[PDB]
Structures are given as structure tokens and as C-alpha cells.
Design a protein around this nucleic acid. Structure first.
Ligand SMILES: *[C@@H]1O[C@H](CO)[C@@H](O[C@@H]2O[C@H](CO)[C@@H](O)[C@H](O)[C@H]2NC(C)=O)[C@H](O)[C@H]1NC(C)=O
Ligand SMILES: *[C@@H]1O[C@H](CO)[C@@H](O[C@@H]2O[C@H](CO)[C@@H](O)[C@H](O)[C@H]2NC(C)=O)[C@H](O)[C@H]1NC(C)=O
Ligand SMILES: CCCCc1nc2c(N)nc3ccccc3c2n1Cc1ccc(CN)cc1
Ligand SMILES: CCCCc1nc2c(N)nc3ccccc3c2n1Cc1ccc(CN)cc1
Ligand SMILES: *[C@@H]1O[C@H](CO)[C@@H](O)[C@H](O)[C@H]1NC(C)=O
Ligand SMILES: *[C@@H]1O[C@H](CO)[C@@H](O)[C@H](O)[C@H]1NC(C)=O
Ligand SMILES: *[C@@H]1O[C@H](CO)[C@@H](O)[C@H](O)[C@H]1NC(C)=O
Ligand SMILES: *[C@@H]1O[C@H](CO)[C@@H](O)[C@H](O)[C@H]1NC(C)=O
Ligand SMILES: *[C@@H]1O[C@H](CO)[C@@H](O)[C@H](O)[C@H]1NC(C)=O
Ligand SMILES: *[C@@H]1O[C@H](CO)[C@@H](O)[C@H](O)[C@H]1NC(C)=O
Ligand SMILES: *[C@@H]1O[C@H](CO)[C@@H](O)[C@H](O)[C@H]1NC(C)=O
Ligand SMILES: *[C@@H]1O[C@H](CO)[C@@H](O)[C@H](O)[C@H]1NC(C)=O
Ligand SMILES: *[C@@H]1O[C@H](CO)[C@@H](O)[C@H](O)[C@H]1NC(C)=O
Ligand SMILES: *[C@@H]1O[C@H](CO)[C@@H](O)[C@H](O)[C@H]1NC(C)=O
Ligand SMILES: *[C@@H]1O[C@H](CO)[C@@H](O)[C@H](O)[C@H]1NC(C)=O
Ligand SMILES: *[C@@H]1O[C@H](CO)[C@@H](O)[C@H](O)[C@H]1NC(C)=O
Lengths: 775, 774
RNA sequence: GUCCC
RNA sequence: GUCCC
């Protein structure tokens, strides 16, 4: 169907709207720019390769380039792979870019460059030099950048990439970059704000440096500035998981009261980890548009109880005051200033790491009439006491987050303590939707009763994951939660003695009781898995990793359940050969469409398992079972089966004729098995098939009878990589078909490979020339 | 060093004291008996193979066989592999055993046999026919067994191997087996005790059958019987994890009051799962020697409060009354009869599954003066309340077991609920420190010193699997002045204070594994230098804690010999460019064993090895995804004896091992990506004694890499599952493997050529390379 | 591949 | 293969 096979080891995409020819060679183990890149290429990505040099030959024919992404072909040693260290810094010979008359974006991050590359064309708008070894900025090296708008220079001198000196910037180095809008000098050992900066700046990043003082005129001319980040100058170093040097004498970053007066457009001010003890109101006199203020990791514990500056912030959207606790102090309560009541626009308030014992309703009163408040984050506070009923005054909120506390009767897991939360990777550049969420995960709740939730009937999602709840539920414990749609009960010690557990939650749509294995791990104890009958609108049930090997009831029943996750249990024991009692465990889940019984140690499936499946089953996973055999003809019982996942097993054969096993099957996943050959008529007349994964098997040969053309051209995707293809003359049809097909087959360039014979070992089949088979 | 390579795919051993030649072909994927078995073989084991028949040719030459173990060459379908099902039952041709004039033991279990094989020699003492399809025993088929002493016929008719009829035994079938001592008819669908049995019987196994009634004379003549097991006749079926049919009408197994009167020698009586509601004292009138009584899984809840029969058991050593609870009843307390006080000899008492809310000191008083009592097991009782101080009255005990309860302020994990605890396979802990209180798997959320009042005698305390989410500061275990072992795993320890555990001044072993909770939340203080105060601590386990951060930079101890640090995040702690924790273990000055496997260490930053403590002997770096390894840094480890690098991604070995470590004895490199050895790999590495290179991708090994003066002082050399290329370049290695005295496992099954073409899949031990010498 | 799984 | 790991 193709006349010219594509052999370039890069993905090529056409977006004819934007006249873009997109060539993506990311992570192709290239040691040179491959030949044959399209002459019309506009976006070329070569990030993560080991191309040791650039020269005028590099992009000779590619005059239409608007973007070159040439990152991380020589990453600094501590930042890069230790198994494939870059032996030499990238070399850029003269004139490699001056021909690129339309080049607007150049990324040379992560190449151990020692200087700002010269000869760049005046069309350039974005230059990125992060994670190089450039630590002295001279005005002369910048004259070439007259039209630059975006300039990334950070991560060139810090602990993961040291330069052993202070960063140097010549006076007015940037002043004549009259279009410069974004300047990033983060993570660079900078000691002062460089001046004078061009007044076109909209975003200025100076965080993670060694700036001890702001001069009162450092930002005098920046009347267009919208984002300013000075964080991590005079850091708060307690429990830092990176080497951290504080300013002497516990001093804060010193900011004159009038330092921000020019910044009338400022929307984002980030003052994280500046060891601040006070926030002067005078800072915000002329900033009336501020929307985001980060004051986390300072020493503002007492200031939070005073906080006059909040009176100047009526348009603030987000406020972060996390991790301001005084060292070795466990306060009795949280003292929030009445001034918080003037934050009329506030949507998001975070005060993690304040560290206090008892939360009481009146302490949140400054927040009662914040009418736009959506998120209240009081996580990681070691709170021991909290009457949850107090949140009856907060029904307008979307998320109340008390995660990680000690209460008893979506940010990354590293967030406040990582070095640079916004740093780029070499590679690239949850129940809230249900309604009001109370997040009590990772607390010390050992026993629950109905009155714990009094006045919380508005809740839609309750997260109790990771508490200590070791209790037989009998339907009395959640009685006030009449509107709850989602309960996360995972990582507790549920004791399913009663089939009435959870039945008070009459609107429940999703229940997670995964990782409640404790009572399932002790022999002779009663478990009622038929508790589903009472939950009349339950759509999704997760009971993964419960180690379930026994059940007192023999059937689960539901008129509503659509999805059951049963991964990580012991159906192999429940379905012990000769024991027929549980072969219909799921049969009466009459609306069940999705069943995950992967990781159940099912080395074989006893007869009756498929007949015992509920009638509308569409999506079945049997992955990661150590399955060693499979009677494909039993799929005939699964009359609505569309997706079958058999990945990561030990199958050695496929059925003689897939179409004779299932008339409905669309998606067949067989990756990571032990298959060495296909049957002669494998896919004959399998007209419903749309997706086939045979990757990571041991296939040597595929003949045309197995893969008829009228089935292949209906496939959305066919995965074949990481097999054991033998590239002899017996393989001519398969090699020809692979080279010429339009069917999507991923990894042709790197993992659809010959293992033999001798000559062709390690060769991609897409490049294979078999003319000698036709002489 | 050998003149004749052994190519027989079986292990052959000589024990010349007993004139035994032991040939073990277990699980060799054989489809025939191999030729060339030693003519002098006395023990031949062929278990787990697919040999479809036996004939006079089978053992022609093996006149000296005393034992044939030919089990499981055709196992019943529900018991056997579904990926390699046996297609047809083992065929035994006539005259196959009659020549075996010295044969004393024949195991034919698991072969789908339909009848008792005939033509067996008169020397036979033991015959085993378990897991076949023999369900009718006729006296004529047993005449050949005149001299038999041990006869195993069980598992021929039960739910994993049905016969669809009742088992049949002819009247007096066994009577003329005048030397028969052990008879097992378990798991067989038997409906009555077969009579008359020979009076030589010492052991009679009739459990897991369908016997509804004992006749008063069923055991009349059995005056030598020492073990009788009638369990699982009229089973208690509640929560049975196997298909279970109870006797009709809720009846127990019906046993007349005098049924045991002849059994004067009886030592073991097993009446597990007989749905008994009463235990008549009259049963034990004439049994004065009984030592073991199993009454678990009956309905004896009310009998336990009465139990007059215990007065007749002054020599009982072991008593099991577990799982006798009444259905749907949660008793307030445990009512133990005073009659328990007459069990003068009792060492072991187990009452799991009695099911009661509150354990109370006076409830145990009948046990106060049982002076040989060693184990009290009250696990799985859903006890909510128990003052632990009550065990001040039980300091003589070795184990107090309250595991699996709900207390708050060594039997397998399947035991009382498995179908047959004693069934055979086809193929075949802190008590030692002293008084042990097992509180594992309860609901303890908070501990304080008074919880342990009067328990200073305890040597081992098990708190694993509780709910303890608490900062310890050294005040919580003050009375436990003698404790040597604390299992604190699977809780939520909060190491805020470096004074944690310092009150346990006799502590030698501390397990705080799987206390990851407080370690996985960022910004929290953790004091890993808490070891400094524990002056006699030998072993510390802190596996699976997800430790990625620490407030202190060094752990210190003068005593610790063993640290288990598996399943943490030293990769994050030792982030490249952060030097602060590179001496975390340096000041564990007596540390000999360090397990830092499963730490995501894809590389080791420079300084990790210099930071190791000086006496390190045994280092595991397994399961780290290690991609590179600067072998020369092993020079820092001057006492290193064992290095475990298994399950990583290493691709090379050092150019010269001897230049990396003068001390290294054991190098484990299995499951890596090594494709070739360096030219002089083991040159002059005379200290090396154990080398595991299995499951790599080695194609070729030459003598320069593997000098012989090093190889033959190796206790073991593991090479299986590689990618050996068997060309004429391999002539030295093939010869050396064929002729070496060094132990190399799996030669018969996984030391294999992958090429070239001709030799693919061929064992290197069988390889003939004469064409390389033409 | 008799119990486990 | 810049932050994660
Ligand atoms: C940031 O700059 C400081 C100096 O301003 C560097 O510190 C010097 O480091 C050298 C070599 O490590 C020492 O010999 C000097 O004594 C240091 N000088 C001072 C004034 O402390 C520091 O190394 C730089 N940081 C990074 C990450 O490169
Ligand atoms: C044990 O023996 C009983 C009979 O005593 C078997 O039960 C019969 O089984 C067949 C086939 O399942 C039925 O058609 C009969 O109706 C049954 N009869 C009665 C009276 O139950 C039973 O199958 C045997 N058990 C085993 C494990 O083989
Ligand atoms: C060995 C006992 C098997 C049956 C069982 N299972 C459980 C269980 N999963 N949780 C319990 C929790 C508290 C008390 C008893 C049980 C219990 N029990 C005992 C029990 C169950 C039910 C009742 C009636 N509420 C009384 C007692
Ligand atoms: C964001 C807090 C980091 C420091 C820290 N770590 C912990 C910890 N591991 N457990 C605690 C348990 C209770 C109270 C406070 C802490 C605590 N804290 C705060 C704290 C620690 C110590 C003290 C003095 N007892 C008071 C307060
Ligand atoms: C291509 O490059 C241009 C110029 O920098 C950029 O605006 C655009 O987003 C890029 N598109 C893709 C798909 O890489
Ligand atoms: C809260 O703290 C502020 C400042 O420390 C103080 O003005 C105020 O009185 C305190 N309020 C309470 C209730 O402690
Ligand atoms: C919690 O507050 C609610 C609502 O104000 C009140 O009804 C209840 O008494 C309080 N509960 C406790 C245990 O203090
Ligand atoms: C509940 O919180 C846990 C623990 O933080 C989290 O992993 C989980 O995704 C949350 N569940 C939902 C449904 O948001
Ligand atoms: C359920 O248990 C709760 C808590 O023990 C109790 O208040 C209630 O009486 C029980 N209800 C039923 C119907 O058993
Ligand atoms: C669940 O099954 C048990 C029988 O094992 C029965 O007692 C109970 O009533 C059932 N419950 C429901 C809700 O079906
Ligand atoms: C089938 O279910 C799996 C969950 O295991 C899901 O990830 C996948 O997208 C589903 N596929 C289809 C085609 O619905
Ligand atoms: C499978 O193929 C045979 C032969 O064409 C046909 O008789 C049979 O009905 C088919 N079965 C199914 C389930 O398609
Ligand atoms: C060898 O066979 C004899 C005869 O049954 C037996 O007594 C002995 O224990 C067996 N030893 C081994 C190691 O198989
Ligand atoms: C403590 O009990 C646990 C849980 O039953 C068990 O796994 C562990 O081996 C015990 N510890 C010791 C030291 O015996
Ligand atoms: C440790 O905590 C206990 C618990 O209340 C307390 O009695 C004791 O004073 C504390 N010890 C120290 C040294 O702080
Ligand atoms: C452990 O280190 C911390 C500081 O990192 C110190 O406060 C504490 O006293 C030390 N404790 C011991 C036992 O060394």
C-alpha cells in the first residue's frame, strides 16, 4: 500500500493546518543526525541521544526549521546516566545555525556547553541553555539575541551541576534585549539581582540562588512584570532533602518595603523558603492585581495570627502558608488572623505544616464568609482532635484536605520539600469530580460511628484511605452521609462479617475497599462478599490486594455494578480444581462489563469459570497470573467479550482460528508471553478484531495465512516488537508486508529486529534488503 | 580430573556405610528410564517425570534395588499440571517387580493405577498407592503382601480425585497381613471401619471419610494400636474451604462408650471435625497412656465448661480444643472447667476459635498448677479486652499466643481449616530466646509502660501487625527489663525521638520492618541514629520502610552485627551531588551483614564503598536495577566475603577480580545481562569459592577467563540458563564441564547449547565435539 | 505434580 | 538523561 517504506528512525507527523512537518527522534540511541530527514521539516527533536557535534552539515538542507530541540545529548555527569556517561561536551562548529533563517526556538539544554553559542540567526525568539556549564554572562555574548523573547539560563551552577564559583552577570548584560519577556536564572549560584533588566519583562525567575538582599531599585523599571519568583534565597533548611546552606545568623532575604512599587501588573509572587519572619503590608501598597502568593517554608507561624498584609490582597486567588512552624513547637491550636476575612477572592488556601494538636470550629471563622473558597488544605499538621461537623459551614468548598494527620476519637508526594518543583525533564518541554470531598486519608481513625459525620450529609466523596479502621461494619456507621457517591476505604482493616456493611450509603456509586487484606489472611473467619446486593446504584467496586482466598457466600449479586477490580486475590484457591462452589461468584453481577482478575495466581482456569461469568462481560483482564495453558474455545461462553488481556503470562500458543473462539473480540493483548509461532490460520476471518498485541514474545516467523490482508487493514494497531524474528528467505512476505503496510506498528525503528541469521543479527527489519532471495 | 564424564541425568551418591547407591532422577523431564543406571543401585527415585510404563526391561540389571520411588508419573487430572496433563495411566507389565528379590519399599503414588499391582516380591515391607484410582480392596489382591508392614491407600476417592462410588473393602481383607503395622485409608469415601483388622496395627488412619458410626467391636483386637485418627467423619462444615458434606440430621460421628477399651497402648487420638457435642468420660476408661488428643472443629463449646473426661487423662501432653464455637455466638468470657487442673502432664493447650470478648485472670485459674505447661494458644478468639499482667502467673510457659485477636486499650497459616494437614507432596521466629508473648495481629493502637506491668520475665514480645501509630520516647516498655527480641514490624512507628527503645537494655533483635507510614510523607523528622543507646543490639531489621530522608546523617552502634535495610530509597538518600548520607552506616563499627537490596540503586555514587563500616563481610545489592558497577571500589571493603549482585542489569565483570578484592569468597551474579567474561576475569583469584553466573547471556567461556587453578577449589559454579555457543571455540569449556569435579547444578536440565543449528537445545554434558579434532 | 500454591 | 525515580 506504500510505495516507499519509511526507514528514518524518527516519528514524522504532518499538521497541514500549521504547515508543520514534525520530526521526533527522541531517545533513538542515535550517534549522528540520521540522513533523509524531510527537507520541509519545521520541528526537529533530537533530545536524549549521543550526537557528539553539530556543524553546518547538521541542518544543511533544512532551511524551513522553526524549532530545533537538541537537549540532553551530553548531560552533566551527576544529572545523566551513569551507565552511559557522556565522554565529551557537545561541540557546535561555526555557522551551524546562521543559515536557519526561520529558526524561532532553540533548545540546547543539557549538553555541558561552556559558553553561549554564537552565530544564532536574528529570527530566534526562544533560547534554552539549562543544565550546561555557563556561569558568566557578558553583554557581548548577548548582542546576537536582539530579538529574543524567552531566555532560560538556569541549573548551570547548583549542587547537581556545580561550577564552584559565584555566577557572574555584567552590568546591563540584558538591558538591550528590548523584546525579552521571560528570564530564568534559577538554580545558578547568583548573588545579586542583575540590573538593569529590560522593562519588557513579564516573568523573572531568580529562585534557588544566593541572593541575600534585594536593592530598593532592583525592580524599578519592570512595570510589565507578571510573575516574580525569588524563592530559595536564604532558604529554610530544616529537613531539606538536598544540601542546603542558610543565610548567616538565621537572616531572612532582605526586601525593602518599597521593592515592589513598580510592579503594578504583578499576578504571581513566589517567596517560598526565604526564611521570612514578617510580611510587611507596605510590600503590597501598589500591587492590587496579585492573584497567587506563595509564602511556604518560611518562619511566619506568629505572622499567620496577625497578617495585616492580607488587607491589601482583595483579588488574591491562591495563598500558600505551608511549613511555617516554629522548630520543636507543637502548638495547641491554629491561630488564624481575622484579616483572612478580607481575602474576598480567595479560592485556594494551604496551611500544611503549621503543626498543632487541636482544630476547633471557631478557629476557622475568619474563613466563613470567603464566598469563593474552594480548597482548604490542612494536611501534615499532626492534628489529633477535630470535630468533623465543623465543616457544615463549608459546603461550598470542593476539597477539604486533612490528609496525613493523627485524627482519631492534586499535589505530588514531594512538593514542599523538593529542590525545584518546576524543573524540566530531558524528555518533554481520584474523586474530586464527584463533588464536595473530605480527605481524611492517612490519619489514625481506628473506629467510626454515625455521629462522627453529623451535619455532613452534603459530602459527595469521603477519603478514609490509610486509617486504622479494624471494625465490622453493619450499616450503621455512615448514616448521615446521604449524598455520598464515592467512599475510599482502602488501606484499612475492614471486617466483612456483615452483608449489610455500607448499605446506609444509598447513593454510593464507587466503593474502594482495596488493601484490606488483614482479616482475609486468617483462616476460619467469616467473610460476606455478597454485601453488594444492598447497594442499588453502585457502579464500581475495587477490592484489589485483599488476598481473598475464602468466602462464606458463594455468589456476589448486583443489579447495578458495571466494574469490578478483583486483582491481587487468590481465586486460584477459591477455584481449587474439584471445588465447584465458587465458579459462579460473579455470575449474578448482571450488569458487569469490566472484570479485573489479574494477579490471582491462576496458572490454569478450571472448567466452568467462563460459563460462570456474568452475561454482559466486555473487558476481562487475566494478566500476570502465570497462566500456562488456555482453552481458547471457552471464550465462546463470553458472548459480549470485546477486550481480553492475557499479558504477562506463560502462554505458548494462540488458537488455530481466533474467529472460531469469539465473534465479538476486538482487542486481544498477548504481550509478554512465551509464544514462538502463530497458527497457520490464526486471524482468518476475524472481522471484529481491531487491536492485537503480540509484543515481547518469542516469535520467529509470521506467514501470510496467519495474517490475512482483509483483517490487517481493519487493525487500529498491531504490536510486534521485541520478538525473535528470523530474517531468512522464508521471511520475505513478512519483511515486505512490514515495510509497506499502513497499519500502525510502534517501535519499528528500535525494537522490531532480526536476531539472525548471523549477517542480519541486530538489524531492523524495516531496513532489511532481501533481493538475494529473488535473483 | 574425571576419566569418564557422567552423562546420566540423575544425581548419583554413595553412602558406603549402608551399601546404598542412591540414584535420584526427581523431576528430570524423563519420558523413559535412562540407560546406564549403576548396576549396584539400591535407591532409585523417578518421581515427577512422564515415564508411561514399567516392564521387566525397566529394572532388569538392578537386582540390588531395595527402594523404588516411582511416584507421580501420571497424577490424577485435578491434582496434576494442567499445562502438562498425563494422557494415559501408567502401564505396569507383568513380571516387572518379581525379579526384585531385595525390594523393601515401593512407591507408586499418583499414577492413576486402577488395581493393586501384582507380582510383588515377598521382601516388600512398604507399599504406597496414594492418589491412584483404586477404590475396591479384595483379599485376593493382598495375598502377595504377606510380609507387608506399611500400606498407604489413601487419596484414591475424594473431591480432588473422585471415584463416584463408596469405597469397598472385603470382610477380613487385611486380617492375614500378620505383620501389618501402619494402615492409611484416609480421604477415600470409606463408609465403615473395615473388620477384622490384624492385631499388629500400631497406626490406623481413617480420616476424611464417610464413616457415620463406630461399632463397639470395630477396634476390639487392636491392643498394639498407638495412633488412631477418625477425624473428618461427620465433618463440621462451617467455613470449610473445601467441598464439605456433613452427616445428616446434624449427627456426630457415633462412637460407643466402650469403643476404645481394647486400645491400652493408644498414645494419639485424633477426633478433629467429627461434629461432636459431648465427650463421654467412659471413652478413656482403659486408655491411661494417651498423650495427644485432638478435639478441634467439633461443637464442644458447652463441653469445655464441664469436661469431666479430663480427669481420666493425667498423662496427656497435648490437648487441642480449637474451633468449637457455637455458630453466631459471641461469648462474654471463657468458661474453663476446673477439670483442666487434673491434666498434670499437659505441655500444650490450644483453644483457638472459642470466640469470646474478655479474657480474665480468674478464667485461667484451672491452669495455675499445671506445672509442665509450655504453650497456651488462645489465638483467633476475637478477644477485645485482656489485662496482659495476668500472665505473671505463667512465667514458666514458653509461648503465650494471643495472635489474631482484637485486643486494644509453629503451625502453618492454613492448619485447622485445611483438608489434609498430613498429605504428601509429589516431591518428598523468636521462641528460642525464651518466654514469648505473641500479640501479633491485634488492634493495639497505643502502648504505655503499665500495659506490661509484672511481665519483666518476657524474653520475646511480638507486636507485629498491630495499629501502633505513636512516637516512642523510651518510656513505653519500662517493665520489660529482660526482653531480648521485639517484633515491631507492620505498625506505624514514628521515629521522632532518638530515645526510642532505649529502655529495652537487654534488646538483641529489633524488627521495625514495614513501618513505612511516617517515612512516606515529606517534611517529617526521622531519627535513624536511635541505635546508639541500645548497647547489646545484634540485629536490626528496617525493611520495606520506604526511607528516603533522615534528620541524622549517621547511624551508630558498638554492637550491631546485622542490618536489614531492604526496600527503602537509598537511591534518593544518596542522590548524586548530595554527600550528606554517604556515611550513614560507617559508624556501625561491628557491622558484618548489610542488606541494601531493593533500594532502586541503579548506580552507586562514589563514596558509598568508602563509607561502609570496616568489618563488612556480607553485602547484598540485589534487586536494585544496577546498571553499572565500578568493581575496583571493592578495594575499600577489606573484609568482604559475600557479595550479592543478583537480579540487576550488569553487563560486564571486572577485568581482574583479584585486583578488586583479596577477600571475596562468594560472588553472586545471577540474573544479570552479562554476555561475555573479561579475558583474565578470575586470574589468580585464589580466594574465590562460590560463583553464580546463572541466568545471564554468556555465549563463550575461555580458559584465560576461567583458569583451572581457581575453578577446582570452588565449592560450586553456577552456569545454567545462559546462551552457550557450542562451536569448536568451546572445546575447552565443554571438556572442562564434562570432566570437572566442581559441583555445577542443573547439568541435566539447563546447561544447554543454543546453537549452532545442529546442537541447539543440546545439553553440554552430552556434547560430542570430535569433529573439532579431525 | 497427592498437602500448600 | 535537567524535576521525580
Ligand atoms: C557557589 O559559589 C561559592 C562561592 O561564592 C562556591 O564556594 C567555593 O567553593 C570552593 C570550592 O568548592 C571553595 O574552595 C571556596 O572556599 C568556596 N567559596 C566560598 C566563598 O564559600 C560554591 O562552590 C558555589 N556552589 C556551587 C554549587 O557551585
Ligand atoms: C462417595 O460415594 C457416594 C455414594 O455413596 C457418591 O455419590 C453418588 O455419586 C453419583 C455420582 O456423583 C450419583 O449419581 C449418585 O446419586 C450418588 N449417590 C448417593 C447416594 O449420594 C459420591 O460421588 C462419592 N464421592 C466421591 C468423592 O467419589
Ligand atoms: C471463628 C469464628 C468464625 C465466625 C466469625 N467471623 C467473624 C468475623 N469476621 N469478625 C468478628 C468480629 C467480632 C466478633 C466475632 C467475629 C466473627 N465470628 C464469630 C461470630 C460471628 C458472628 C456472631 C453474631 N454476631 C458471633 C460470633
Ligand atoms: C512538619 C514537622 C516536622 C518536624 C516534626 N516531625 C515530627 C514527627 N515525625 N512526629 C511528630 C508527632 C507529633 C508531633 C509533632 C511531630 C513532628 N514534628 C513537629 C514537631 C517535632 C517535635 C516536637 C517536640 N516534641 C514538636 C513538633
Ligand atoms: C513547533 O515549533 C514551533 C516554534 O517554536 C512551536 O510554536 C510549536 O508549538 C511546535 N510544535 C510542535 C508540535 O512541536
Ligand atoms: C494570635 O496571634 C496573634 C499574633 O501572635 C495575636 O495578635 C492574637 O492575639 C492571637 N490570638 C489568639 C486567639 O491566640
Ligand atoms: C461536634 O459538633 C457538632 C456540631 O456542632 C455537635 O453537634 C457535637 O456535639 C460535637 N461533637 C463532639 C464529640 O464534640
Ligand atoms: C484518597 O487518598 C489517598 C491517600 O492520599 C490517595 O492515594 C487516593 O488516590 C485518594 N482517593 C481518591 C478517590 O481520591
Ligand atoms: C450495628 O452496630 C452498631 C455499632 O455496634 C450498633 O449501634 C447497632 O445496634 C447495630 N445495628 C444492627 C442492626 O445490628
Ligand atoms: C449472604 O449470604 C449468606 C449465606 O452465606 C446469607 O446468610 C446472607 O443473608 C446473604 N446476604 C445477602 C445480602 O444476600
Ligand atoms: C479494559 O479495561 C482496562 C482496565 O484493566 C482499561 O485500562 C482498558 O482501557 C479497557 N479497554 C477497553 C477497550 O475498554
Ligand atoms: C467453529 O467452526 C466450526 C467449523 O466451521 C463451526 O461448525 C462452529 O459452529 C464454529 N463455532 C463457533 C463458536 O463459531
Ligand atoms: C533408601 O531405601 C531404603 C529402603 O526403603 C530406605 O530405608 C532408606 O531410608 C532410603 N534412603 C534414601 C536416602 O533414599
Ligand atoms: C511475629 O508474628 C508475626 C505475625 O504472625 C510473624 O510473621 C513473625 O514471624 C513473628 N515474629 C517472630 C520473631 O517470631
Ligand atoms: C516520654 O513520654 C512519656 C509518656 O507520657 C512521659 O511519661 C515521659 O515524661 C517522656 N519522657 C521524656 C524523657 O520526655
Ligand atoms: C541524633 O541526631 C540529632 C541531630 O541530627 C540529635 O539531636 C540527637 O541528639 C542525636 N541522638 C543520638 C542518640 O545520637
Amino acid at each position: 500500500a506504500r510505495w516507499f517504506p519509511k526507514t528514518l528512525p524518527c516519528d514524522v507527523t504532518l499538521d497541514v493546518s500549521k504547515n508543520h512537518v514534525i520530526v521526533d527522534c527522541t531517545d533513538k540511541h542515535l550517534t549522528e543526525i540520521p540522513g533523509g530527514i524531510p527537507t520541509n521539516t519545521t520541528n526537529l527533536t533530537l533530545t536524549i541521544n549521543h550526537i557528539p557535534d553539530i556543524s553546518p552539515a547538521s541542518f544543511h538542507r533544512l532551511v524551513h526549521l522553526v524549532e530545533i530541540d537538541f537537549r540532553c545529548n551530553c548531560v552533566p555527569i551527576r544529572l545523566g546516566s551513569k551507565s552511559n556517561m557522556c565522554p565529551r561536551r557537545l561541540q557546535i562548529k561555526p555557522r551551524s545555525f546562521s543559515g536557519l533563517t526561520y529558526l524561532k526556538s532553540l533548545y540546547l539544554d543539557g549538553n555541558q556547553l561552556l559558553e553561549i553559542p554564537q552565530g544564532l540567526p536574528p529570527s530566534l525568539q526562544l533560547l534554552s541553555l539549562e543544565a550546561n556549564n555557563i556561569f558568566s554572562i557578558r553583554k557581548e555574548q548577548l548582542t546576537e539575541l536582539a530579538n529574543i523573547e524567552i531566555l532560560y539560563l538556569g541549573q548551570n551552577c547548583y549542587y547537581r551541576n556545580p561550577c564552584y564559583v559565584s555566577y557572574s552577570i555584567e552590568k546591563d548584560a540584558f538591558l538591550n534585549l528590548t523584546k525579552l519577556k521571560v528570564l530564568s536564572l534559577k538554580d545558578n549560584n547568583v548573588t545579586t539581582v542583575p540590573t538593569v533588566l529590560p522593562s519588557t519583562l513579564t516573568e523573572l525567575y531568580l529562585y534557588n540562588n544566593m541572593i541575600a538582599e534585594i536593592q530598593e531599585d532592583d525592580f524599578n523599571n519592570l512595570n510589565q512584570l507578571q510573575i516574580l519568583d525569588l524563592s530559595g534565597n536564604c532558604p529554610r533548611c530544616y529537613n531539606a532533602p538536598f544540601p542546603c546552606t542558610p543565610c548567616k545568623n538565621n537572616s531572612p532575604l532582605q526586601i525593602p518595603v518599597n521593592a515592589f512599587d513598580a510592579l503594578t501588573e504583578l499576578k504571581v509572587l513566589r517567596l517560598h523558603s526565604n526564611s521570612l519572619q514578617h510580611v510587611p503590608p507596605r510590600w503590597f501598597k501598589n500591587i492590587n492585581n496579585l492573584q497567587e502568593l506563595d509564602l511556604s517554608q518560611n518562619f511566619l507561624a506568629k505572622e499567620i495570627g496577625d497578617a495585616k498584609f492580607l488587607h491589601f490582597l482583595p483579588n488574591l486567588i491562591q495563598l500558600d502558608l505551608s511549613f511555617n512552624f516554629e522548630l520543636q513547637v507543637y502548638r495547641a491550636s491554629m491561630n488564624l488572623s481575622q484579616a483572612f476575612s478580607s481575602l474576598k477572592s480567595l479560592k485556594i488556601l494551604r496551611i500544611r505544616g503549621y503543626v498543632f494538636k487541636e482544630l476547633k470550629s471557631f478557629q476557622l471563622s475568619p474563613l466563613h464568609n470567603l464566598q469563593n473558597l474552594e480548597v482548604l488544605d490542612l494536611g501534615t499538621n499532626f492534628i489529633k482532635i477535630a470535630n468533623l461537623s465543623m465543616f457544615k459551614q463549608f459546603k461550598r468548598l470542593k476539597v477539604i484536605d486533612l490528609s496525613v494527620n493523627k485524627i482519631s476519637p492534586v499535589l505530588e508526594q514531594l512538593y514542599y520539600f523538593r529542590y525545584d518543583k518546576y524543573a524540566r525533564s530531558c524528555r518533554f518541554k481520584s474523586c474530586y469530580k464527584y463533588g464536595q470531598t473530605l480527605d481524611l486519608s492517612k490519619n489514625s481513625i481506628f473506629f467510626i460511628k454515625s455521629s462522627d459525620f453529623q451535619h455532613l450529609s452534603f459530602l459527595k466523596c469521603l477519603n478514609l484511605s490509610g486509617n486504622l479502621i479494624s471494625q465490622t461494619l453493619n450499616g450503621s456507621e455512615f448514616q448521615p452521609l446521604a449524598e455520598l457517591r464515592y467512599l475510599d476505604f482502602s488501606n484499612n482493616r475492614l471486617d466483612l462479617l456483615h452483608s449489610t456493611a455500607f448499605e446506609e450509603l444509598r447513593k454510593l456509586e464507587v466503593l474502594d475497599i482495596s488493601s484490606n487484606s488483614h482479616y482475609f489472611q486468617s483462616e476460619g473467619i467469616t467473610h460476606m462478599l455478597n454485601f453488594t446486593k444492598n447497594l442499588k446504584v453502585l457502579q464500581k467496586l475495587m477490592m484489589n490486594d485483599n488476598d481473598i482466598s475464602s468466602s462464606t457466600s458463594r455468589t456476589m449479586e448486583s443489579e447495578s455494578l458495571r466494574t469490578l477490580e478483583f486483582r491481587g486475590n487468590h481465586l486460584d484457591v477459591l477455584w481449587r480444581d474439584g471445588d465447584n462452589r465458587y465458579l459462579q461468584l460473579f455470575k449474578n453481577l448482571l450488569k458487569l462489563e469490566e472484570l479485573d482478575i489479574s494477579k490471582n495466581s491462576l496458572s490454569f482456569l478450571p472448567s466452568g469459570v467462563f460459563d460462570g461469568m456474568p452475561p454482559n462481560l466486555k473487558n476481562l483482564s487475566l494478566a500476570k497470573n502465570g497462566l500456562k495453558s488456555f482453552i481458547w474455545e471457552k471464550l465462546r461462553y463470553l458472548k459480549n467479550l470485546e477486550t481480553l488481556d492475557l499479558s504477562h503470562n506463560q502462554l505458548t500458543t494462540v488458537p488455530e482460528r481466533l474467529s472460531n473462539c469469539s465473534r465479538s473480540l476486538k482487542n486481544l493483548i498477548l504481550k509478554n508471553n512465551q509464544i514462538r509461532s502463530l497458527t497457520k490460520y490464526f486471524l482468518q476471518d476475524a472481522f471484529q478484531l481491531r487491536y492485537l498485541d503480540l509484543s515481547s514474545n518469542k516469535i520467529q516467523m509470521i506467514q501470510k495465512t496467519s495474517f490475512p490482508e482483509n483483517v490487517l487493514n481493519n487493525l487500529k494497531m498491531l504490536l510486534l516488537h521485541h520478538n525473535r524474528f528470523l530474517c531468512t528467505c522464508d521471511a520475505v512476505w513478512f519483511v515486505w508486508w512490514v515495510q509497506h503496510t499502513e497499519v500502525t506498528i510502534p517501535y519499528l525503528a528500535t525494537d522490531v529486529t532480526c536476531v539472525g541469521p548471523g549477517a542480519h543479527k541486530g538489524q531492523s527489519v524495516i531496513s532489511l534488503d532481501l533481493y538475494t532471495c529473488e535473483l
